[PDB]
Paper text:
The RsiG–WhiG cognate pair is the only known example of a σ–anti-σ complex that is targeted by c-di-GMP. Here we show that the same σ–(c-di-GMP)–anti-σ switch has been co-opted during evolution to regulate distinct biological functions in unicellular and filamentous bacteria, controlling type IV pilus production in the genus Rubrobacter and the differentiation of reproductive hyphae into spores in Streptomyces. Moreover, we show that the anti-σ likely originated as a homodimer and evolved to become a monomer through an intragenic duplication event. Structural analyses revealed that these single-motif RsiGs form an antiparallel coiled-coil through homodimerization, enabling them to bind c-di-GMP in the same manner as the monomeric twin-motif RsiGs.
Thus, to elucidate how a single-motif homodimeric RsiG interacts with c-di-GMP and its partner WhiG protein, we solved the crystal structure of the R. radiotolerans (Rr) RsiG bound to c-di-GMP and Rr WhiG to 2.93-Å resolution. The R. radiotolerans complex contains one WhiGRr molecule, a c-di-GMP dimer, and a RsiGRr homodimer. In the complex, the RsiGRr forms the same antiparallel coiled-coil homodimer as observed in the apo RsiGRr structures. Because no c-di-GMP was added prior to crystallization, the c-di-GMP molecules seen in the Rr (RsiG)2–(c-di-GMP)2–WhiG structure copurified with the complex from the E. coli expression system. The bound c-di-GMP dimer is coordinated by two RsiGRr E(X)3S(X)2R(X)3Q(X)3D repeat motifs, with the same arrangement of contacts as observed in the Sv RsiG–(c-di-GMP)2–WhiG structure, but again, in this case each motif is provided by each subunit of the RsiGRr homodimer. However, in contrast to the S. venezuelae structure, which shows no contacts from the WhiG σ4 domain to c-di-GMP, the WhiGRr σ4 domain makes extensive contacts to the c-di-GMP. As noted, in the R. radiotolerans structure the WhiGRr σ4 domain is shifted relative to the S. venezuelae structure such that it directly abuts the c-di-GMP molecules, positioning residues Thr237, R239, and K243 from the α11 helix of σ4 to directly contact the bound c-di-GMP dimer. In addition, the Rr RsiG homodimeric coiled-coil, though similar to the coiled-coil in the RsiGSv monomer, lacks the long interfacing loop seen in RsiGSv. Instead, RsiGRr employs N-terminal and C-terminal extensions from its coiled-coil to bind WhiGRr. The Rr (RsiG)2–(c-di-GMP)2–WhiG structure revealed how sequence-identical regions of the two RsiG subunits can flexibly adopt different conformations, allowing them to interact with distinct WhiGRr σ2 and σ4 domains.
Numbering used by the authors:
A (entry chain T): 28 to 101
B (entry chain D): 23 to 99
């Protein structure tokens, strides 16, 4: 929370100390871990939604075809 | 890879069986999902942009200093 604002008024980084950067880094890292996770998940759910469109209906996908779809070829 | 799944109470919130959705609805869901995907990938970009900037500054001055002793224990067990 305090990370979003301090990073906006801190202007340049030398004004901070190392043990303060370790703090900004920590609270910005996991926010990136879960935003990237949430990203890859919905990105994968899009490849199966688009793949579903071309299989015309209730396409149950064998573990064989899921690999192809998840790479990008839906 | 675990903390994300815990706070991911909204990523699998009201999801539906994609093999049950009708062809018409799939296109309607593709639109909604395509908009959040492009919005989370931007916030992702600007965020990881900060991280690289702050990680560079740290390494520049003090850095990830880890005494060869403690580091050995990390690699050992
Ligand atoms: N449906 C779907 N969409 C996807 C997938 N992966 C990425 N996208 C979306 O489409 C764009 C992908 O561009 P790219 O040609 O992979 O081009 C990417 C890629 O070249 C690079 N990039 C971003 N993150 C990474 C990463 O973690 N690793 C690598 N190697 N390149 C990355 O930055 C470019 C722009 O990324 P963004 O701004 O996020 O823009 C991304 C994102 O909005 C996927 O598997 N499925
Ligand atoms: N072509 C393409 N491939 C993609 C894209 N998004 C993800 N990938 C692939 O999927 C892997 C996992 O990405 P993640 O789970 O978001 O995990 C990512 C993400 O969390 C993070 N990352 C990616 N780019 C940056 C960056 O510029 N700064 C920081 N701090 N982290 C980054 O590190 C991991 C990157 O791992 P990579 O070795 O790049 O490995 C990436 C890359 O191989 C994309 O848009 N386009």
């Amino acid at each position: 929370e305090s990370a979003e604002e301090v990073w906006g008024g801190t202007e340049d980084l030398t004004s901070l100390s190392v043990e303060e950067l370790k703090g900004l880094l920590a609270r910005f890292d996991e926010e990136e871990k879960r935003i990237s996770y949430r990203r890859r998940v919905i990105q994968g759910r899009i490849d199966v939604i688009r793949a579903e469109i071309v299989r015309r209906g209730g396409a149950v996908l064998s573990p064989e075809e899921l690999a192809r779809v998840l790479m990008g070829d839906v």
